[PDB]
Amino acid sequence: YAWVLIAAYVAVFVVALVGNTLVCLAVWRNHHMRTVTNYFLVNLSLADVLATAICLPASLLVDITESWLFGHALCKVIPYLQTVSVSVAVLTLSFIALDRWYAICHPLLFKSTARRALGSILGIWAVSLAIMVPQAAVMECSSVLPELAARTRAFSVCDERWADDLAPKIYHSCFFIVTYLAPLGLMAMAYFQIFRKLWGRQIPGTTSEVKQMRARRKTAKMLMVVVLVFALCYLPISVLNVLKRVFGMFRQASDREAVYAAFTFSHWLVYANSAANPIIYNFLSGKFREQFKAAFSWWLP
């Protein structure tokens, strides 16, 4: 099953790096692509490239070897970068939802500009980089057999170190709510209201307002799919983390094989999400589809 896992990780790594570079390039090279949503979708691609390039190979080696082969320093740095990336992704999706909700449901309160989106993007990185410092603090690299640590990294493990049994329960309950449940629950409600507004009863006297509304339905439909695919890809890892850290599950040696498989699939799924988003844009955005088609047909075959 290791060949199947390596191949799946290789496929995801290649599709994510190519797909996400194409998203960044399409927006950078084309003025018509520089919309508020597409600036945030570029930020999602930057967070997804950070995870794919630096964290995906380390995660594939842990899932294959059942050991940490990158030393003490990277045992703090790689978990930190993976968590920062999840925070940038979820906060980016939250700010898109917020932008679309105000623009469509409450149009005359806040100004939606590309320059304000760049300020929001910097804020997302500033917040994500700071709130994940406690995650890096608890990461520790230890050898299961101390007397062999000097000759091999085979029996070395990277894991969280907690001084008491209550602190990880409080921390991981907050982690789940902040990185998954509260932003996705709020986004679901925002998109339900956007759905009712865009697909609801047409108000008469609207100007050739008609074009923006048609364009908005296409974008909202795409964004709802991105949010639903994010919710599904991050559901196993989020649930497994809570059950392990808060409810003290998966500690029995008899279950080792079932637990290994479930956690390994949940780790791959996170990375599969970085590969999924450019594929979603290709099928649900004629603008991105046109750019990707140009990239594979004449920019470079």
Ligand X SMILES: CCCCCCCC/C=C\CCCCCCCC(=O)O[C@H](COC(=O)CCCCCCCCCCCCCCC)COP(=O)(O)OC[C@@H](O)CO
- Spell out, one character per residue from 56 to 95, where the chain touches ligand X: x when CB under 6 A holds, - when not: --------------------------------------x-
Nearest to 74 by CA among 63, 89, 59, 86: 59
Give which of Na ion, ligand 7MA, ligand SOG, none residue 86 binds (C-beta under 5 to 8 Å, depending on kind): ligand 7MA
Q: How far is the CB of 226 from ligand 7MA (least distance, A)?
A: 16
**Dihedral Cα 46, 15, 19, 300, nearest 10 deg:** 130
158-196 burial, b at 16+ Cβ within 10 Å, e below that, comes to: beeeeeeeeebbebbeebbeebbeebbeebeebbeebee
Interface region with ligand SOG, contact rule CB under 6 A, candidates 31-39, 71-79, 223-231, 250-258: 71-79
Of the two residues 168 and 183, which places its CB atom closer to ligand X in the complex? 183
Give which of ligand 7MA, ligand SOG, Na ion, none residue 183 binds (C-beta under 5 to 8 Å, depending on kind): none
Give me the residue label for tokens 């949940």.
266
Distance (Å, rounded) from C-alpha 159 to C-alpha 275?
A: 27
Interface region with ligand X, contact rule CB under 6 A, candidates 108-116, 142-150, 183-191, 233-241: 183-191
Nearest to 138 by CA among 187, 75, 203: 75
Of the two residues 143 and 193, which places its CB atom closer to ligand X in the complex? 193
Among 5, 8, 131, 136, binds ligand SOG (CB under 6 A): 136
Distance (Å, rounded) from C-alpha 102 to C-alpha 151?
A: 59
16-27 burial, b at 16+ Cβ within 10 Å, e below that, comes to: bbebbebbebbb
Give which of Na ion, ligand 7MA, ligand X, none residue 97 binds (C-beta under 5 to 8 Å, depending on kind): ligand X
Q: By CB under 6 A, tell whether 42 contacts ligand SOG.
A: no
Q: How far is the CB of 193 from ligand X (least distance, A)?
A: 5
Interface region with ligand SOG, contact rule CB under 6 A, candidates 30-38, 169-177, 250-258, 266-274: 169-177
Nearest to 247 by CA among 159, 182, 168: 168
Of the two residues 37 and 135, which places its CB atom closer to ligand 7MA in the complex? 135
241 annotated to bind ligand: yes
Give me the residue label for tokens 């079932």.
258
Number of residues that bind ligand SOG (CB under 6 A): 52
**Helical spans, DSSP H, in the chain:** 2-29, 36-50, 56-65, 71-105, 114-131, 133-138, 167-176, 182-198, 210-245, 256-284, 286-294
Q: How far is the CB of 239 from ligand X (least distance, A)?
A: 15
Q: Tokens standing for 235?
A: 């559901």
Q: How far is the CB of 272 from Na ion (least distance, A)?
A: 9
Q: Is 142 helix (H, G, I), strand (E, B) or coil?
A: strand
Number of residues that bind ligand X (CB under 6 A): 16
- What does R_g of the chain's alpha carbons equal in angstroms? 21
Distances (CA, A) of 143 to 22, 163, 251, 252: 42, 18, 19, 20
Q: Which residues of this protein are in contact with ligand SOG, per CB under 6 A?
A: 9-10, 13, 46, 49-50, 57, 60, 70-71, 73-74, 76-77, 80, 91, 105-106, 109, 116, 119-120, 122-125, 127, 129, 133, 136-138, 140, 161-167, 169-170, 173, 176-177, 193, 239, 242-243, 246-247, 249
Annotated binding site: 241
Annotated binding site for suvorexant: 241
Q: Which residues of this protein are in contact with ligand X, per CB under 6 A?
A: 94, 97-98, 101, 178, 181-183, 185-187, 189-190, 192-193, 196
